[PDB]
């Protein structure tokens, strides 16, 4: 889904735009003998605030078998903390350290 | 004869006892060793701290060995290509300079 | 004698270069401990014979 | 009785994981696992393939 600069400038004030943004973390390296690129890929639109507030995990591949890719994200510990119930019955996280 | 023999009489004499004349495989058949720093195969060190004898150095056969490998086919990529651009004028070429 | 020579020739000209074949990473709890010790994470499905 | 509640089994959450894959990445060493452990752990390992 594409967006001219003209539409970014002249869209109604109340309407929700729908931008797209690449995560190019999982783009494999060029072959050693791919022809050189004289051209320069260019960009105009950027977010002003963090996007990917919803992100839990990222780049689930291996960089060099053992190493971690730059920009990969492991899930937050809280996703995995089955805690217990408080005496009134509310959910709790596990105690951290002691006591 | 039976210089080639590795094992023999793979049956039980009396359930637990060994048949006379049965042969267990030589230990060397089973010694995946390691590689020497130059990359030759070696047997495991015997006792300590003596360095492992290279497998080619001695006459025993060994069937567990460490082979190096490419993780995947290396011919997979695009072939190299160049942009030859022959000279503008043949008469202007400087074949001199020796 | 000729055969030895050709053996010796065929080895002198063995230009083979191994690439990893299909392989498996058995989940360990699924292997008996004697085999779990011998095993090192992964192995070719064509294990061969030792 | 009044139907004050709606009895259910294996409940929906309010939040779910959603995943975008790049299909070209794939580990070559197939990982055999216990059939039981595969049936506990398995929806997860598929979703986070």
């Amino acid at each position: 889904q594409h967006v001219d600069a003209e539409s970014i400038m002249t869209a109604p004030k109340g309407k929700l735009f729908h931008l797209q943004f690449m995560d190019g973390l999982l783009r494999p390296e060029p072959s050693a003998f791919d022809p050189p690129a004289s051209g320069e890929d260019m960009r105009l639109i950027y977010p002003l605030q963090p996007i990917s507030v919803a992100r839990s995990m990222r780049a689930i591949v291996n960089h060099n078998e053992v190493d971690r890719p730059r920009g990969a994200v492991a899930p937050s510990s809280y996703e995995m903390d089955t805690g217990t119930l408080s005496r009134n019955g509310d959910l709790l996280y596990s105690p951290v350290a002691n006591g | 004869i039976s210089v080639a023999r590795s094992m023999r009489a793979i049956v039980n004499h009396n359930e637990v006892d060994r048949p006379r004349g049965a042969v267990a495989p030589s230990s060397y058949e089973m010694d995946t060793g390691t590689l020497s720093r130059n990359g030759d195969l070696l047997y495991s060190p015997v006792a300590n701290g003596q360095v492992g004898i290279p497998k080619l150095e001695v006459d025993h056969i060994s069937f567990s060995n460490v082979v190096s490998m490419m993780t995947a086919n290396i011919r997979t990529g695009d072939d190299m290509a160049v942009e030859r651009v022959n000279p503008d004028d043949v008469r202007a070429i400087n074949i001199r300079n020796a | 004698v000729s055969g030895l020579l050709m053996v010796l020739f065929k080895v002198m000209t063995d230009n083979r270069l191994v690439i990893v074949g299909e392989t498996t990473t058995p989940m360990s709890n699924t292997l008996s401990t004697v085999v779990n010790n011998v095993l090192r994470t992964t192995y070719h499905n064509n294990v061969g014979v030792n | 009785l009044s139907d004050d509640f709606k009895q259910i089994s294996d409940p929906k959450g309010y939040l779910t994981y959603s995943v975008k894959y790049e299909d070209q990445f794939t580990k070559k060493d197939k990982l055999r696992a216990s059939e039981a452990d595969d049936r506990i752990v398995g929806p997860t390992v598929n979703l986070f393939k």
Binding site: L25, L26, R27, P28, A59, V61, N62, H63, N64, E65, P69 | M70, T71, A72, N73, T76 | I19, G21, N46, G48, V49 | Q24, F25, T26, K27, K28
Partner: peptide, 26 residues
């Protein structure tokens, strides 16, 4: 029945290296 004997050698399974298009690593 008559007693019998048999033989077996380990088989070759060498094959040209497979061409995969998928890649293990970023």
């Amino acid at each position: 029945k008559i007693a019998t004997a048999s033989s077996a050698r380990q088989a070759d399974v060498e094959k040209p290296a497979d061409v995969t298009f998928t890649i293990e690593n970023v």
